[PDB]
Amino acid sequence: GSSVLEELVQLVAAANIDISIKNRVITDDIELLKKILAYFLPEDAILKGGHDNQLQNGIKRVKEFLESSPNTQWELRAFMAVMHFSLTADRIDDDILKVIVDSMNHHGDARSKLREELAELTAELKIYSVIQAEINKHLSSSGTINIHDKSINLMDKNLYGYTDEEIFKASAEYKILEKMPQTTIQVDGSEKKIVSIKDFLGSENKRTGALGNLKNSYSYNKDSDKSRPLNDLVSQKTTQLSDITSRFNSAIEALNRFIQKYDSVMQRLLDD
């Protein structure tokens, strides 16, 4: 009981942080800190696992957060976000936590920073789903997909739900697309500039990793040890993006559960 809490509190001294509320500074008030923890993490809430092992796992992650962050100044709520989201049944992955934690420590808005990151990811994913459906179609109809000079233009607002060019430019989709290189083509009569499937996929300027040696056309077996087809390469990227996206999306209700829990532990401890 009391011992796990003693262990966590000591964790602020091992890390060289000050914790303030937020305008009380409270790092040295060891009795307050423990009450806050006591109030916010019921005993049977802090996970142990059968062998304990989970508590070791949780303290390890708490410790990791405290030495990773650049801030010596921790806002109390961010500190409690780490505890909540590392030690309990409601734990989330390190990436979402860093997003939440950092913006809390710079007195920003964790909820919007999370939605925003979620939007960047959803944008990328939408663009990949376009590539995916384009790749399938060309194999399905003619056996060959060109991603270079005859690519769909990915820089096209109507691919993403937008009906007005200007609004598209404020989009997460557009911010990504405009970091991409472009390729000169001739469709009908005139010169036009596009963001080819190849331009996007070969880029380092997105979350997902670049594909390194993309050819201009992928075909069905025309005539080894050679690696994967285009459709399989982009299939893998879209699946890992799709997992990250579902986690960040779940983090939203999680964040809300914690904000209301935290707002109702601050309220209950602004008396004693």
Side-chain angles (χ1 to χ4, degrees), residues 86 92 106 124 126 153 197 214:
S86 300
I92 60 195
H106 85 56
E124 202 161 318
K126 246 114 261 76
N153 172 19
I197 289 187
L214 250 34

Side-chain angles (χ1 to χ4, degrees), residues 134 138 144-152 197 216-218:
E134 190 56 21
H138 290 279
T144 307
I145 181 125
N146 189 283
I147 72 180
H148 183 235
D149 78 307
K150 286 162 196 283
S151 168
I152 36 134
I197 289 187
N216 305 330
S217 108
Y218 288 76

Side-chain angles (χ1 to χ4, degrees), residues 63-105:
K63 255 170 146 164
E64 276 163 3
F65 261 82
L66 307 189
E67 89 178 278
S68 181
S69 307
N71 290 104
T72 47
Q73 308 302 293
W74 270 65
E75 213 267 288
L76 175 71
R77 197 217 252 138
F79 180 80
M80 295 310 111
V82 183
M83 300 294 185
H84 180 67
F85 276 136
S86 300
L87 300 170
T88 79
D90 298 323
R91 49 187 164 162
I92 60 195
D93 284 290
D94 50 321
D95 57 4
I96 309 174
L97 199 47
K98 194 195 169 23
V99 159
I100 282 148
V101 150
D102 288 334
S103 79
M104 278 179 181
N105 287 328

Side-chain angles (χ1 to χ4, degrees), residues 79-223 225 227-234:
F79 180 80
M80 295 310 111
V82 183
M83 300 294 185
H84 180 67
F85 276 136
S86 300
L87 300 170
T88 79
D90 298 323
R91 49 187 164 162
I92 60 195
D93 284 290
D94 50 321
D95 57 4
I96 309 174
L97 199 47
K98 194 195 169 23
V99 159
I100 282 148
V101 150
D102 288 334
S103 79
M104 278 179 181
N105 287 328
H106 85 56
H107 310 104
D109 188 17
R111 287 163 155 149
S112 58
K113 188 55 44 196
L114 173 57
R115 296 223 171 248
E116 150 176 325
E117 259 263 11
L118 169 54
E120 312 196 332
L121 287 160
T122 289
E124 202 161 318
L125 185 49
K126 246 114 261 76
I127 292 160
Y128 272 101
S129 286
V130 176
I131 284 149
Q132 209 157 216
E134 190 56 21
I135 283 161
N136 159 260
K137 273 254 143 70
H138 290 279
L139 313 175
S140 274
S141 301
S142 65
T144 307
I145 181 125
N146 189 283
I147 72 180
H148 183 235
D149 78 307
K150 286 162 196 283
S151 168
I152 36 134
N153 172 19
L154 298 165
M155 178 63 101
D156 183 14
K157 80 183 137 283
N158 268 152
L159 286 168
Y160 313 108
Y162 300 78
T163 48
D164 170 278
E165 194 45 28
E166 194 64 22
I167 301 315
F168 179 52
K169 297 189 143 121
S171 76
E173 284 77 354
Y174 180 85
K175 283 160 178 90
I176 297 173
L177 290 146
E178 74 134 308
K179 273 167 168 229
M180 307 296 127
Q182 295 197 207
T183 42
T184 315
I185 65 136
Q186 289 144 241
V187 246
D188 201 311
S190 280
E191 194 173 271
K192 70 122 65 213
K193 242 197 183 155
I194 66 159
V195 178
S196 87
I197 289 187
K198 187 195 207 93
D199 297 321
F200 174 72
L201 285 178
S203 187
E204 290 165 309
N205 303 331
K206 41 199 221 286
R207 174 75 149 254
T208 38
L211 293 170
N213 233 39
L214 250 34
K215 37 167 167 259
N216 305 330
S217 108
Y218 288 76
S219 231
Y220 60 19
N221 30 267
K222 176 73 183 193
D223 293 290
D225 231 278
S227 185
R228 280 88 80 34
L230 191 61
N231 79 311
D232 183 74
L233 294 188
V234 344

